[PDB]
Amino acid sequence: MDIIFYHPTFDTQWWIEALRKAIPQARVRAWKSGDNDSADYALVWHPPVEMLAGRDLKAVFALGAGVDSILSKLQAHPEMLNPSVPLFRLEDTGMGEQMQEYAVSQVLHWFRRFDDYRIQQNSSHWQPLPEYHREDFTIGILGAGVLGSKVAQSLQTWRFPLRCWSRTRKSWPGVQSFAGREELSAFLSQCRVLINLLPNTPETVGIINQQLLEKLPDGAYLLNLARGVHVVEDDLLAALDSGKVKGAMLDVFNREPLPPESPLWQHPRVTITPHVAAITRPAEAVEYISRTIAQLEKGEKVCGQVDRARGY
Amino acid sequence: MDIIFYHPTFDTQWWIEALRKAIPQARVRAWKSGDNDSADYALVWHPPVEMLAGRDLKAVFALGAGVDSILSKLQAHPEMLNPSVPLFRLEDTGMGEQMQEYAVSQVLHWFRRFDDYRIQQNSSHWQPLPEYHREDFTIGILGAGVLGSKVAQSLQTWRFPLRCWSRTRKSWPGVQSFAGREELSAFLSQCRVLINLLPNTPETVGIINQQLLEKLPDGAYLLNLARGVHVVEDDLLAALDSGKVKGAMLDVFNREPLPPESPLWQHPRVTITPHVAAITRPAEAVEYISRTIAQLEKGEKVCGQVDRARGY
Ligand SMILES: NC(=O)c1ccc[n+]([C@@H]2O[C@H](COP(=O)([O-])OP(=O)(O)OC[C@H]3O[C@@H](n4cnc5c(N)ncnc54)[C@H](OP(=O)(O)O)[C@@H]3O)[C@@H](O)[C@H]2O)c1
Numbered sequence: 001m002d003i004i005f006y007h008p009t010f011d012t013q014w015w016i017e018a019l020r021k022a023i024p025q026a027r028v029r030a031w032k033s034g035d036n037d038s039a040d041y042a043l044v045w046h047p048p049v050e051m052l053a054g055r056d057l058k059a060v061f062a063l064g065a066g067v068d069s070i071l072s073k074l075q076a077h078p079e080m081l082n083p084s085v086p087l088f089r090l091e092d093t094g095m096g097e098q099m100q101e102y103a104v105s106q107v108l109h110w111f112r113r114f115d116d117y118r119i120q121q122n123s124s125h126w127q128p129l130p131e132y133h134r135e136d137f138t139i140g141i142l143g144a145g146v147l148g149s150k151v152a153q154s155l156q157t158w159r160f161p162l163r164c165w166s167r168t169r170k171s172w173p174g175v176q177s178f179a180g181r182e183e184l185s186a187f188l189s190q191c192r193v194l195i196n197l198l199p200n201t202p203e204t205v206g207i208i209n210q211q212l213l214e215k216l217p218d219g220a221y222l223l224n225l226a227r228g229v230h231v232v233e234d235d236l237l238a239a240l241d242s243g244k245v246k247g248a249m250l251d252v253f254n255r256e257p258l259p260p261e262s263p264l265w266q267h268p269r270v271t272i273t274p275h276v277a278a279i280t281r282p283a284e285a286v287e288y289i290s291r292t293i294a295q296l297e298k299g300e301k302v303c304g305q306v307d308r309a310r311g312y
Numbered sequence: 313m314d315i316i317f318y319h320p321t322f323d324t325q326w327w328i329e330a331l332r333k334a335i336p337q338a339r340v341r342a343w344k345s346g347d348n349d350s351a352d353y354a355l356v357w358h359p360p361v362e363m364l365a366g367r368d369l370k371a372v373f374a375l376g377a378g379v380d381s382i383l384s385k386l387q388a389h390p391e392m393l394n395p396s397v398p399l400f401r402l403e404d405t406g407m408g409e410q411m412q413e414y415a416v417s418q419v420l421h422w423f424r425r426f427d428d429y430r431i432q433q434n435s436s437h438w439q440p441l442p443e444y445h446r447e448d449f450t451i452g453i454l455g456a457g458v459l460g461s462k463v464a465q466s467l468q469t470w471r472f473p474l475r476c477w478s479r480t481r482k483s484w485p486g487v488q489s490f491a492g493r494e495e496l497s498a499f500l501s502q503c504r505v506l507i508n509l510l511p512n513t514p515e516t517v518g519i520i521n522q523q524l525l526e527k528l529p530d531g532a533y534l535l536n537l538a539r540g541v542h543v544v545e546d547d548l549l550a551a552l553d554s555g556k557v558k559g560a561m562l563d564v565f566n567r568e569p570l571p572p573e574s575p576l577w578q579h580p581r582v583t584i585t586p587h588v589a590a591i592t593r594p595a596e597a598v599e600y601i602s603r604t605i606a607q608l609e610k611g612e613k614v615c616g617q618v619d620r621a622r623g624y
């Protein structure tokens with residue numbers, strides 16, 4: 001078999017060699033413009049149209065969890081990827097644990113009032129503060145997928161009340177499952193902490209806006225680990241300035257890098273990371289891809305597949 | 313039975329009523345100066361000498377995990393507590409989980425470089441940073457007791473390499489046990505994070521000093537959750553200023569409240585909480601005390617007992 005590989009910034013030579021060793025019968029090459037030779041599988045991130053157009057590939061693997069970029073490019077360029085070609089993404093491959101590390105750390109940080117103690121420390125002021133209680137710190141996960149479930153599981157360990165929101169009902173024993181737009185209001189009503197692990201799709205753009213934020217309990221917290229387009233940043237700033245939202249930690253933004261003129265940078269209740277919440281671990285990704293190709297060859301059901309009609 | 317209760321600041325009336333309901337055969341009263349009536353058990357925190365002197369109690373329960381204060385008072389006033397009287401403390405009673413919340417949150421905070429991203433955010437500067445790896449983030453727990461073990465267990469969940477230090481060897485399957493002063497140097501050599509959960513005893517005063525800190529790996533972190541006397545604060549500041557220690561989070565200090573002139577307050581790499589890492593949960597404490605008294609009455613082995621000769 002023949003594999004073409006393309007990634008705009010990863011260690012391309014490292015990946016080729018690691019793919020060759022995991023799939024020794026395979027010829028792996030980096031894709032460059034003009035290369036119209038045969039290929040069975042394409043491993044891509046932000047690929048140019050030309051890499052895929054007209055190719056009858058056995059599969060394409062997007063080298064990330066999110067596929068909003070490749071799918072929006074296919075919408076604008078329907079000739080890029082034949083409907084015959086199955087599209088896969090990276091499920092977990094280390095990003096699950098990475099989202100658990102980020103979420104658990106910051107949820108506990110807020111639950112233990114480290115933000116308030118930092119403010120008081122800035123004035124050299126010693127003052128024990130009242131403890132928060134788990135019954136008032138219900139956590140809601142917007143999005144209940146591969147990463148959402150992982151974050152829910154790790155927070156349940158700490159005995160926080162937990163709820164999740166998705167399109168379809170979930171069966172997680174101690175997590176209250178809300179489903180659909182008709183249940184979103186009820187889901188938000190108790191979310192002391194709101195964690196966003198949704199995909200970017202046309203149905204979810206701008207979902208974290210003024211109307212959503214004002215349904216939250218007072219003194220709520222926002223963790224945006226998904227996509228910048230999910231949040232209307234001026235609406236968030238207004239809810240931070242009114243005291244509706246006590247704190248927001250944001251890893252993703254409508255424009256990346258976040259422009260220096262954004263008021264989010266210096267807002268006292270905002271914490272910013274530069275889109276680093278969860279990156280695939282190359283060796284786990286090479287193992288996921290090699291195992292998935294082997295399953296495709298054997299006719300075993302795989303499920304890590306993108307549905308172009310639903311958008312994720 | 314008769315129980316006298318004394319605590320300088322807790323909700324005394326709440327505790328009396330809760331003890332009455334957990335031990336309905338018991339007469340519970342708040343101790344005031346001049347009260348020389350009989351008593352079988354004393355529940356105390358920072359008690360005056362007069363409360364205990366000359367009393368042949370069946371047991372005294374110190375209402376905290378640490379007993380350095382009561383034991384140093386008994387040293388200065390040997391008449392305060394007859395050697396006949398067994399002394400107990402609060403084992404866990406909720407403080408285990410509270411130490412896990414604090415430690416896990418801040419270890420993950422440092423592991424994910426949230427401290428560096430905060431510095432960069434202060435300048436509106438966007439810059440993904442290299443990931444740290446678990447093999448370079450060995451965590452050492454100074455003290456391997458009721459709370460030390462709980463913290464070790466919760467950090468093992470995150471797959472950090474783990475080691476502990478105590479007087480006696482431990483058998484925790486994935487935690488390397490170091491024991492005694494003769495093994496302290498070797499224990500420190502790999503501690504990227506040093507977590508202090510030792511008791512204050514004459515043998516441990518000032519143990520975190522210049523000689524200990526310089527045995528740590530470069531860019532180490534310090535979490536002091538135990539007693540302020542364990543740390544020589546000027547030595548810590550020097551290791552923070554030389555870059556030996558990248559960050560210190562401190563809940564306890566040689567003088568409490570930490571005086572405003574301490575350079576720790578405004579040091580950029582120091583985080584301060586006002587001795588709030590783990591407070592006993594009254595209802596768990598009343599359950600621990602009532603169950604321990606019942607076991608004493610039935611002749612069942614109890615072990616939560618202070619050893620006045622060893623000092624803890
Ligand atoms: N560094 C970073 O910040 C970073 C890294 C990796 C991933 N991410 C983000 O995380 C996202 C999720 O990854 P994942 O692997 O967890 O995706 P996933 O397994 O596909 O899970 C997506 C979940 O979102 C829910 N969802 C989709 N559309 C919805 C709608 N209209 N209403 C309600 N719920 C909806 C789905 O519901 P059903 O279960 O009912 O289908 C599903 O539970 C990615 O899309 C990416 O944007 C960010």
Ligand SMILES: NC(=O)c1ccc[n+]([C@@H]2O[C@H](COP(=O)([O-])OP(=O)(O)OC[C@H]3O[C@@H](n4cnc5c(N)ncnc54)[C@H](OP(=O)(O)O)[C@@H]3O)[C@@H](O)[C@H]2O)c1
Pocket residue numbers: 377378379403404407454455456457458459460477478479480481492509510511512513515516537538539563564587588589590591624
């Ligand atoms: N809010 C707060 O900040 C807060 C709250 C609660 C407790 N604390 C502190 O936490 C401490 C520990 O509580 P705990 O219940 O875990 O106590 P513990 O169960 O008695 O554990 C103490 C541990 O320290 C070790 N140790 C004692 N002396 C030592 C020495 N000379 N060299 C090496 N190791 C030594 C002991 O070793 P062995 O196991 O070999 O005996 C033991 O493992 C308390 O003393 C208190 O100061 C702080």
Ligand SMILES: O=C(O)CCC(=O)C(=O)O
Pocket residue numbers: 063064065066067275278279280
């Ligand atoms: O988009 C990226 O920069 C990689 C991390 C991510 O968000 C994803 O895997 O979808």
Ligand SMILES: O=C(O)CCC(=O)C(=O)O
Pocket residue numbers: 375376377378379587590591592
């Ligand atoms: O000493 C206190 O203020 C209570 C918390 C503590 O450190 C202990 O339980 O020993």
